[PDB]
Amino acid sequence: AIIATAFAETVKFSGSKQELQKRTLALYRQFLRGAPTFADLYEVQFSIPTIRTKIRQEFERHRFVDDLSIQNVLYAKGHMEYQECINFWKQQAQFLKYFPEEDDIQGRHQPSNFVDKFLKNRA
Amino acid sequence: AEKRIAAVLESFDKISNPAAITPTASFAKDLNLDSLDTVEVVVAIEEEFGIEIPDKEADEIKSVNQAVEYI
Amino acid sequence: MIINIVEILIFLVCVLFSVAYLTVAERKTLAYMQRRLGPNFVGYYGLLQAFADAVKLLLKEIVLPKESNYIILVISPLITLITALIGWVVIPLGPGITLGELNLGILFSLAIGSLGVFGSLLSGWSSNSKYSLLGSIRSTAQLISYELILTSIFIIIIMFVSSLNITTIIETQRVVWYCIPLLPLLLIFFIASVAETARPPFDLTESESELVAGYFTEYSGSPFVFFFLAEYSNIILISAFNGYLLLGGYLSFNYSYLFNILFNDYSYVSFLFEGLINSSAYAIKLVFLMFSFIWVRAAFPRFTYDNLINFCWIILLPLLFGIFLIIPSTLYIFDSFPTL
Amino acid sequence: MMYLTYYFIEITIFLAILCTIFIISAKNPMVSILYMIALFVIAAMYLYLIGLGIFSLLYIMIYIGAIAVLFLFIITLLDINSTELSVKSNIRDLPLVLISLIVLTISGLMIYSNDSILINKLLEAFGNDYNTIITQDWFNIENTTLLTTIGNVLLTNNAFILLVLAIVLLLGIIGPISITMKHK
Amino acid sequence: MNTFIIFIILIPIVGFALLAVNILLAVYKPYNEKLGAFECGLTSFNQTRLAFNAAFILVAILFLPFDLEISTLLPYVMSIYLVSNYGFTIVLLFLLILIIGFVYEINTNALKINKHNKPNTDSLIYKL
Amino acid sequence: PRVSSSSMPTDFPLPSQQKPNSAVDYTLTTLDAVANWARQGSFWPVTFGLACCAVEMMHVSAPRYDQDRLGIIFRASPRQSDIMIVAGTLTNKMAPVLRQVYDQMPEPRWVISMGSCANGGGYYHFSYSVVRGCDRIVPVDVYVPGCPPTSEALMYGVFQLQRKMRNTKITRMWYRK
Amino acid sequence: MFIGTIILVLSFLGFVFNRRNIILAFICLETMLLGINLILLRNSVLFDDISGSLFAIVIIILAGVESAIGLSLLVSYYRLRGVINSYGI
Amino acid sequence: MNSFENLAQDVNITRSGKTLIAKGTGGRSSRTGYTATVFGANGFLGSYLTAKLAKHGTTVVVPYREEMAKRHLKVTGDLGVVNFLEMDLRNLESIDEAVRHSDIVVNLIGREYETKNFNYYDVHVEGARRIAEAVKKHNIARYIHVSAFNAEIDSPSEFNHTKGLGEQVTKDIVPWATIVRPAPMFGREDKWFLDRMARSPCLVSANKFQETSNPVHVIDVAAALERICFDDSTVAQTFELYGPQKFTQKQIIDMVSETLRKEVRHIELPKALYQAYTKATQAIWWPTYSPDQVERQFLSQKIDPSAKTFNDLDLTPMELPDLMFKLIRPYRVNVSQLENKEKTFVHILD
Ligand SMILES: NC(=O)C1=CN([C@@H]2O[C@H](COP(=O)(O)OP(=O)(O)OC[C@H]3O[C@@H](n4cnc5c(N)ncnc54)[C@H](OP(=O)(O)O)[C@@H]3O)[C@@H](O)[C@H]2O)C=CC1
Ligand code: SF4
């Protein structure tokens, strides 16, 4: 038959927000635990704490989503991303998409006020 | 032995009272650690001792005392 | 000293250039079997092709991968080539016409031959890849397995001769080539020689493996040249074993009558002519065997590892043990044990 | 010539000492196996020098061609842990190593003598300051070499030993299968 | 200093000379991406040694006894006339004993790698 | 310290207009000729056979054109290859793989872009998943047009690369330094 | 007989004071046997006596079988543990 | 959307009266409107500078000697962005062709050894003089000339002496040029630095490995150069680009060893013996440690008290210790619970 792969979870839409909260915290634990494996697979310059910080920021972004269906989709996609990272299916190039700040300073001029944005036609 | 756990859980943010770590202190009640923060501290503990902890037991942990009781 | 140096230079040049032109011959012969031409452009009639490949490779950068024992990866192909070429020191092109006239020449052939598995064995260890280790393990298993077959046939032949001197073994075939009473052994020896050189259809390691091109996948530059040269040199040398064990070496036909017509006394002219006839006989036998290697490459698909291990240990080896029984029995029945 | 060619035996001895030390001190056990192969080539050199080139070829055929190949095969397939030579681990052995070296070497040279006095026993060991005189005679008309004579005695005078060796080889087949294969 | 020894010295010299020419003439520009092991263009994770089949071990281990068996016949073929009929009988007995071991190896299927997964042949039965 | 002045010439001809005159010039010309002859005659490409262009590449090795008559042999391993031929659409998912294979080639090395997809994106230029020309990923020596280029067009491109090889200064370039 | 004696003694000391890996123990066994055979073959030459060479041949065959069995034992030991410790025995 | 992080504004006026309007958002298909010539662009620093320039679509003219060596540069820009010219310092016309259309000329041409065709004076004084004359004749808006740290006219080193001479001749010819002195530069595949320390057979010092400098990341030098390129308030200023914290050579070797997990071999030799060796080795055709580099081994970095620094470019150099593991990764050498866990797995099968 056609069997599932490493760290594959069948898609199940949780009927309750608490039963989803359990699964979500388990996924967060999985990510935090895989951080050192990630740093080894993807030959990263930065530290393991930086990876774990990034993971926290990712999970933080959806801290206030209310609709159960949306949380279900966010969870299923987050698990897909975990499976992609832990199996080394990603290359370094796509993994480093998650760490834009880790790259060096892009230049002297990142405008913040109106006048600087207006001088670069970005007002 | 427990002093190692206190050292692991002392070096974390969001807590302004390092001396508030009493052997029976609850993370969500005393430290004001988030659910995510609780997962982080549990992972830090199990990494410091090198031991893997299963899902049910990890989730049921809620305080320093339970951490030592399992340690 | 001077004569020794001249003779060694002549023999070495002939062997190295024969190896160089065998690669061109394989390309051309495969091509015409496949209704194409093959190299006809680098040099006249494509006669400089091998030298172009050699110069190109000699100017190519050597890469040492990061997890690699660089010394072992640069010396393994070197030792395989060195043993492969050392094997030529005992091949005679006429009675006693050899670089090394050893009473233990057959034993020398077998011992230097048994030094031939270390390239495959060490090449996989050269890196730190498990793909590489498994592939090297399989190739080594195939090599020693068919080494048993070749050694058995050697011993079966020595049963007729009772000598380890290669010239003597050739000389006893003036009555009949040993391929005539032992024709199935000719077939088996050729099959095993193809397997022992890891040639198609016995080319698991290079063409169905985890690494794209065998355990030479990581080799560039002169190490690659060493492996390639060692392979073709072993093709010709194992064919020379076939020739002197079963094909009568440098023997063609009795030219006593023709020589007595042509010449009236010994001269350098008669000596040169006899040397040419002997060497041409051995050379034409080598040519037929090289052509057969290429022809078998042209005709067949590959075995798997399991298939070839089964072929060696369940089909060929039991037959060879039965032959171990039947040959001395025939010598006993007819009172034909060979003297020393 | 003469200077080098006279001390070929002594060079083989010195190389053997060095090769053994390198076997024991190798970081990677595969490198240790390679130095073992080197020691066997040196032993073949010595055997050729004393007139036993047939045993040189046999040693190359069997100990390098078969036994060393099996060694490498096994270390490739298997997960081996090894520690490196270090003072922390091995300087504690130096006193016992020195006493054992002296005692074992001296006794291994003395077991060959027939003199009652112990010092004479040891002294005879270093007592070959003389050349052997090689002489000819004409009583051997056959072309009998070492291999032929071995075959002659092994198959007739000592045939029983050959058949018992056949049993030993049978063991070398049946035993490995018994403990490396899981039946049914 | 006959041709044998000179030839044997000469071969490694030529190998080393070709190696030296390649070192002297080719460029040498290592860098991290070039230094990676080539595995189809991707990167794989470092793994514990693969679990292997017992037949892999058994071919190499059984090579040694069979090789010794074969090589023990060298004294016989070098002495066949001298030992003629007595030694012929002895060598037959020796061969038969070794063939019994070959029989054991063949009947135990010792070098066969069995494909662990096999098609299911159970009938489909319904409890009506 | 000591040297305080220069005698450098002012109209020294450029490498594309310089011609041998001094028999050291002639020696270096002969050496470069030998090296370039070997590079042309032993032309070993690694195939990045992505798509339909690869079919035409297969036909270059088929009996009608018989690439190996010129000394061309295709190699599985980049370690044994001098030429990369990008023959097919390069997708974003594939771009790091192509860069990785290119980086593992030992030097000297050259790249042939074959077909519109590899050249600039071709029929899929406006796709969300397609690299718009393989020269965003690797340096390219020769571009072969067509969708696909015919076998003869690909052979023509190989001849252009061989012309570039034949005109390379190697020891003459070092002599200029 | 010097080369054989030195090889045997040094191989024995390497076996005894081995604290590094188990392969060194296997190698030291093989090389002790080699040293014994060298001593024997020199005496065989000096006596012009075939008995020493016969025993040396038998020693070679037995060393082969002993190697095969020792490595089978090592593999059977590996099968349960998956690794060999630097005290692996 | 991308941005023009190098540009302060969208409309720009060069000192030569050319109006440049930047088009697009700042990515590969955008153009800044600037044209730059980078002498020595195929080298270690030049390739980074060319990458940064071509990234935002400023037209880059690259004069080159050997064709195969510049090919990688083409990848850094869109179609028409990187343009190659054949150039040689003894062909004045080729220098003129190289600088003729540019708004910016930066010269990175230097060599750490002498050749049969170019001694230190020919490459650092005469070549700098000729490039500067072409610049001044064509009235180029911006000229950035790169020298080394410790460039001083009466120096014991011929390198430093000819570099100081080149600075003086440049200032004499083009009075509005910007002179940049970098400290030793480390980075991916650097020259006579980290990469040498990670794969040398033996590092041989004639001064115990006591010389000090402030090593600087090459990326930071290129970023500083781009900032100097685009702000016209750096006209006629001197820049000393050096790293944050001072190091000894022995210290750097120690860090390399610790990150490598491999011990680097150091030998100390007498200066006479080692200078003789380097002079002898100059006979081969490939680059090799110079007698003048042995001379410089006795000179420690000396920062000008009055020179603009990274601070004036609003830039903060990275730290060598934090970068070394990344920079040297390809050359890295490589129980109780493991045994118990191993027991549960299968190791041999049918
Ligand atoms: N790396 C460091 O630590 C330091 C470097 N510098 C200076 O930085 C500048 C570039 O640095 P870096 O990249 O490391 O050096 P590189 O050697 O890598 O590049 C130097 C450039 O100058 C060219 N060059 C040298 N001589 C000539 C010549 N006669 N004619 C034409 N071009 C020539 C080279 O061209 P080609 O490739 O054709 O030879 C090369 O492109 C140099 O001026 C250097 O002196 C100073 C302080 C620190
Ligand atoms: S260029 Fe045309 S033929 Fe070639 S891969 Fe693209 S679509 Fe297919």
Side-chain angles (χ1 to χ4, degrees), chain A residues 39-40 42-45 104-110 116 118-122, chain H residues 1-2 4-10 25 227 231 312-314 318 322 326 329:
Chain A
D40 216 8
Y42 298 109
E43 301 188 75
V44 326
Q45 201 284 317
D104 281 5
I105 300 282
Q106 335 175 275
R108 195 189 197 164
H109 297 111
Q110 305 219 97
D116 292 0
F118 166 91
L119 289 188
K120 295 160 73 55
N121 207 340
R122 315 287 291 245
Chain H
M1 277 172 333
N2 298 280
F4 281 106
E5 314 106 29
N6 54 319
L7 295 173
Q9 31 189 355
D10 85 303
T25 39
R227 302 188 183 205
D231 50 23
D312 313 7
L313 307 174
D314 325 301
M318 319 142 79
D322 289 353
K326 165 203 150 191
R329 200 192 265 277

Side-chain angles (χ1 to χ4, degrees), chain E residues 26-83:
Chain E
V27 304
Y28 190 65
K29 268 110 85 185
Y31 61 86
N32 177 52
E33 290 77 37
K34 182 183 294 170
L35 296 174
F38 174 62
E39 40 190 347
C40 294
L42 294 170
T43 323
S44 93
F45 25 59
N46 291 338
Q47 191 59 60
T48 304
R49 295 197 189 262
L50 38 69
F52 48 89
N53 315 266
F56 269 24
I57 283 297
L58 258 210
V59 275
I61 290 196
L62 291 191
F63 165 72
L64 192 32
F66 282 93
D67 197 33
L68 290 162
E69 295 173 327
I70 306 310
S71 87
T72 306
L73 301 168
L74 261 156
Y76 174 64
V77 297
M78 287 318 290
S79 62
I80 183 155
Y81 181 85
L82 275 185
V83 310

Side-chain angles (χ1 to χ4, degrees), chain D residues 135-154:
Chain D
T135 298
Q136 271 170 39
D137 66 68
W138 302 92
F139 301 110
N140 193 40
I141 48 162
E142 259 277 2
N143 186 8
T144 312
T145 75
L146 203 56
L147 191 48
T148 287
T149 310
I150 284 132
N152 187 244
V153 297
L154 194 59

Side-chain angles (χ1 to χ4, degrees), chain F residues 8 173 176-177, chain H residues 39-47 63-66 69 87-89 107-113 115 117-118 122-124 145-149 159 163 180-186 190-193 216 218:
Chain F
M8 268 164 39
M173 180 55 53
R176 294 191 60 110
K177 259 53 171 322
Chain H
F39 285 96
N42 72 273
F44 176 56
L45 169 65
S47 299
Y64 73 93
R65 305 201 276 174
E66 162 45 22
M87 175 265 162
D88 195 279
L89 282 166
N107 167 39
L108 315 189
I109 289 177
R111 196 99 286 173
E112 279 264 26
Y113 58 86
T115 85
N117 273 130
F118 301 92
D122 283 343
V123 72
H124 293 137
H145 173 77
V146 169
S147 277
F149 73 97
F159 187 87
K163 289 291 216 148
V180 184
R181 301 184 232 217
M185 282 185 283
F186 57 95
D190 47 45
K191 248 142 90 145
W192 315 113
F193 211 160
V216 67
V218 66

Side-chain angles (χ1 to χ4, degrees), chain F residues 51-54 87-89 114-118 123-124 146-149:
Chain F
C52 1
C53 273
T89 330
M114 172 198 194
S116 322
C117 289
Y123 211 0
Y124 314 94
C147 186

Side-chain angles (χ1 to χ4, degrees), chain C residues 27 34-42 48-49 52-53 55-56 59-61 63 212 216-220 224, chain F residues 34-35 37-39 41-42 44 61 63 66 68-71 73 75-77 79-82 105-108:
Chain C
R27 293 216 242 163
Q34 291 154 354
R35 309 297 296 277
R36 44 191 195 77
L37 293 187
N40 66 356
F41 195 79
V42 176
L48 292 179
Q49 188 53 75
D53 293 359
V55 175
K56 193 274 303 282
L59 299 180
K60 205 63 181 313
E61 152 192 55
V63 175
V212 295
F216 59 92
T217 298
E218 264 299 340
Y219 285 97
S220 59
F224 181 83
Chain F
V34 168
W37 169 87
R39 285 171 178 186
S42 195
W44 289 1
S61 75
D66 189 24
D68 77 60
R69 94 185 180 74
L70 305 169
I73 306 169
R75 316 295 310 205
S77 198
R79 299 287 181 208
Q80 282 105 75
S81 75
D82 326 293
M105 279 174 97
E107 264 159 51

